[PDB]
Amino acid sequence: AFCNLRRCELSCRSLGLLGKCIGEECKCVYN
DSSP states (O other): OOOOHHHHHHHHHTTTSEEEEETTEEEEEOO
């Protein structure tokens, strides 16, 4: 249904990016 946004945000935090749920998939952006 929908991705795990809190876990996804913490995954991108480790890379210095922001995490977002996009079509049942976790993705990061620079910002």
